[PDB]
């Protein structure tokens, strides 16, 4: 399937994913396209922050869904 991710700068990223992908795999797909370290990435969907050990189907995320990517600075 395909999903969309929106940045704080108002850019939209498109990601190819399966419902069984972890949020850690989604952070790694964003790192591969944008260079952003996974420790600096926060993903929000339907008002809920998404956790590394969970999958897209645990949040009922489906084709053409829009996620909100939050980041600032520092990694510790």
């Amino acid at each position: 399937m395909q999903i969309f991710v929106k940045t704080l700068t108002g850019k939209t990223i498109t990601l190819e994913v399966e419902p069984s992908d972890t949020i850690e795999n989604v952070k790694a797909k964003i790192q591969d396209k944008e260079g952003i370290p996974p420790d600096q990435q926060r993903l929000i969907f339907a008002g809920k922050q998404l956790e590394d050990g969970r999958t897209l189907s645990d949040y009922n995320i489906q084709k053409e869904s829009t996620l909100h990517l939050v980041l600032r600075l520092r990694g510790g």
């Binding site: 929000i44 339907a46 008002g47 829009t66 939050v70």
Partner: protein, 46 residues
């Protein structure tokens, strides 16, 4: 040398660092709140 000017300078730089750091902390907390609230209010492009 002078101690009183240099001392006041060190304290003043310390107060500016404290003020702006508290600003970034409040701005980041309010950003997270807004992002959650907007993910609930309208998740479509608008």
């Amino acid at each position: 040398m002078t101690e009183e000017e240099q001392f006041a300078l060190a304290l003043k730089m310390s107060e500016q660092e404290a003020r702006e750091v508290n600003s970034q902390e409040e701005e980041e907390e309010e950003l997270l709140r807004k992002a959650i609230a907007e993910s609930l209010n309208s998740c479509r492009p608008s």
